[PDB]
């Protein structure tokens, strides 16, 4: 279920060999009024790079795109849309900038089209520098 | 092949020029900082090692 990779997966802060006679979990509220979600506290997954149950601090920018692709491992591509303003012609032009962002297995079901809020962290991989912090289900999507 | 020959405890030294082959024929195929007897060099150099 977990421990698929060759090395033993554990939250390295919690010690799980206390002599006696459930496993505990390390987490944190990551500030800026983000509710440390229920799956963070009551999951049994392991993640270095989860902002709740891992070693990444959120600091700097808080941006938001729409989920575009979910085809890579614990990572997603969001699409950020904005209007760049040309000066000569007093009009705008529709631009975009899609970034690879780290999705924790905490947020169990996100659908491509969902609205995401992302917090800047340290560089996680070659192109990943942001973390998914809250998901807002796209217009309706009840049934 | 001139010889810069120095006596330490005295603290005196002299350049002594050589043009006899046989005298130098011993010194060849030695390495630096090896004591070698100068008994052969000349009759004033008798029982001397340099």
């Amino acid at each position: 279920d977990i421990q698929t990779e060759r090395a033993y997966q554990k939250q390295p802060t919690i010690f799980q060999n206390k002599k006696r006679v459930k496993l505990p979990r390390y987490y944190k509220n990551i500030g800026l009024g983000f509710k440390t979600p229920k799956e963070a506290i009551e999951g049994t997954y392991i993640d270095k790079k989860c902002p709740f149950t891992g070693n990444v601090s959120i600091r700097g920018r808080i941006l938001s795109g729409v989920v575009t692709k979910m085809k890579m491992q614990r990572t997603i591509v969001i699409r950020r849309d904005y209007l760049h303003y040309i000066r000569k012609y007093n009009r705008f032009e529709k631009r975009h900038k899609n970034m690879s962002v780290h999705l924790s297995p905490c947020f169990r079901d996100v659908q491509i089209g969902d609205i995401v809020t992302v917090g800047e962290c340290r560089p996680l991989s070659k192109t990943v520098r942001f973390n998914v912090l809250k998901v807002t289900k796209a217009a309706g999507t009840k049934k | 092949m001139k010889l810069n020959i120095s006596f330490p405890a005295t603290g005196c030294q002299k350049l002594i020029e050589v043009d006899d082959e046989r005298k130098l024929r011993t010194f060849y195929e030695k390495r630096m900082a090896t004591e070698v007897a100068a008994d052969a060099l000349g009759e004033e150099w008798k029982g001397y090692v340099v």
Partner: protein, 262 residues
């Protein structure tokens, strides 16, 4: 750049020094010290340009190498030593004492003080800290580390230190309704009473300040210095008392004094 830089060109020199263009290529790059390069007043600048005691950098050298000038009760034989905000410059042979606090405009005024006032200074605490034995530690705006302080003093307060012992006498808490001089930004040298503090988690908190004449202005929390409890400053202020009247008022006052002279 392959290492630290040592020359500062005259055009790159901070504007509040009011250095003229056609004198040279360079300005005195301030030697490293308690205050920042940008926000200090080098001892050569204060002594030669402001007071006009010396004429050249060699004359300032000839003064400062006779141990005459004393910055914060210690002799400073470095002509480009950074003398910054609240710093107390006592010259004994002349019998004169200056505290470097800002003019109402964004520059350092040359404000003379009494022998008894030139014995202490106000230091803005920057970070509180615990050492290597649960020994509490302060760090002030002028790079002073004070250990075993008063257990109530916190990160944005002001402390009065003595320039012999270097120990904390009395302190002013950072509260609403406390006098603050603004020591950075557009409102540089404005004195006023703290009206509000507006918390922004992750960003720089902005603080609303009220001038005597009902002039309201905001500044980032970093560029504020609590210089008094209530309306009572624990130091002496320059003439003007940090109001920064408008350009139309400064004109009116100038040609009022002019026409009065006649």
């Amino acid at each position: 750049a392959r290492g630290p830089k040592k020359h500062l060109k005259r055009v790159a020199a901070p504007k509040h020094w009011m250095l003229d263009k056609l004198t040279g290529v360079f300005a005195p790059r301030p030697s490293t010290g308690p205050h920042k390069l940008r926000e200090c007043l080098p001892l050569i600048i204060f002594l030669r340009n402001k007071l006009k005691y010396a004429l050249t950098g060699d004359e300032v050298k000839k003064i400062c190498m006779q141990r005459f000038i004393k910055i914060d009760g210690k002799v400073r034989a470095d002509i480009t030593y950074p003398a910054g905000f609240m710093d107390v410059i006592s010259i004994d042979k002349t019998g004169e004492n200056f505290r470097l606090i800002y003019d109402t405009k964004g520059r350092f005024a040359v404000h003379r003080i009494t022998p008894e006032e030139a014995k202490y200074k106000l230091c803005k605490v920057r970070k509180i800290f615990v050492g290597t034995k649960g020994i509490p530690h302060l760090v002030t705006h002028d790079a002073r580390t004070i250990r075993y302080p008063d257990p109530l003093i916190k990160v944005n307060d002001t402390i009065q230190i003595d320039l012999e012992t270097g120990k904390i006498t009395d302190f002013i808490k950072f509260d609403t309704g406390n006098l603050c001089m603004v020591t950075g930004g557009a409102n540089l040298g404005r004195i006023g009473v703290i009206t509000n503090r507006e918390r922004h988690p992750g960003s720089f908190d902005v603080v609303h300040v009220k001038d005597a004449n009902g002039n309201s202005f905001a500044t980032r929390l970093s560029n504020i210095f609590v210089i008094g409890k209530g309306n009572k400053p624990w130091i002496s202020l320059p003439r003007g008392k940090g109001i920064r009247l408008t350009i139309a008022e400064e004109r009116d006052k100038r040609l009022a004094a002019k026409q009065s002279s006649g």
